[PDB]
Amino acid sequence: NDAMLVLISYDVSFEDPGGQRRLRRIAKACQDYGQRVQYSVFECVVDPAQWAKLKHRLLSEMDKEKDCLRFYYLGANWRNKVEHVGAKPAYDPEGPLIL
Amino acid sequence: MYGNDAMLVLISYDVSFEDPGGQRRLRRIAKACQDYGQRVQYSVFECVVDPAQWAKLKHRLLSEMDKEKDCLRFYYLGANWRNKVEHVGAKPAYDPEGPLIL
Ligand SMILES: [Cl-]
Ligand code: NA
């Protein structure tokens, strides 16, 4: 199916030992699908098969009692629904602002 | 409640803590956003706003940010944001009582 963008907000206490480990694992899982717009906010462009696989990984890595994941479904036309103002994102500043 | 023309904007404020200004700007931006929704991360905000409200809020946010040091990204979830947001796990620390989704 058509690729869509999911914006993933991972609310984790990263300065805590476990939180740091879980964030690293979640960041690694998300990395090649898009870009890291904050330390724990990820954009992932995914078709249906990719998203089913990815979502399962993320839910497995998080601690459901301590952390929370929020998914924002921007759809296939995410480009028409995202706006960037200001400095380039710290991560991959050479890439496009919008995926 | 909200009007039928209300929509959700998810605001990611990638703010620089290189100097004390960052925390100040974040405090101002958080305050501007607080009236319209909830704070889902330290610098990620949800705001439910109609067109006129958004025009005013957006202008305020752009004026408070430092455009050289910081970045603001706006994600326009539309009038049907409720069908496009999913929460898993613990309640948000800011406004832990309220609904998970506005
Ligand atoms: Cl922290
Ligand atoms: Na960390």
From Swiss-Prot, chain A:
The keyword Hydrolase applies. CRISPR (clustered regularly interspaced short palindromic repeat), is an adaptive immune system that provides protection against mobile genetic elements (viruses, transposable elements and conjugative plasmids). CRISPR clusters contain sequences complementary to antecedent mobile elements and target invading nucleic acids. CRISPR clusters are transcribed and processed into CRISPR RNA (crRNA). Functions as a ssRNA-specific endoribonuclease. Involved in the integration of spacer DNA into the CRISPR cassette. It comes from Nitratidesulfovibrio vulgaris (strain ATCC 29579 / DSM 644 / CCUG 34227 / NCIMB 8303 / VKM B-1760 / Hildenborough) (Desulfovibrio vulgaris). Keywords: Antiviral defense, Endonuclease, Hydrolase, Magnesium, Metal-binding, Nuclease, Plasmid. Belongs to the CRISPR-associated endoribonuclease Cas2 protein family. This is CRISPR-associated endoribonuclease Cas2. Its cofactor is Mg(2+). Disulfide bonds: none annotated. GO terms for molecular function: metal ion binding; RNA endonuclease activity. It comes from the Bacteria. Transmembrane segments: none annotated. The gene is cas2.
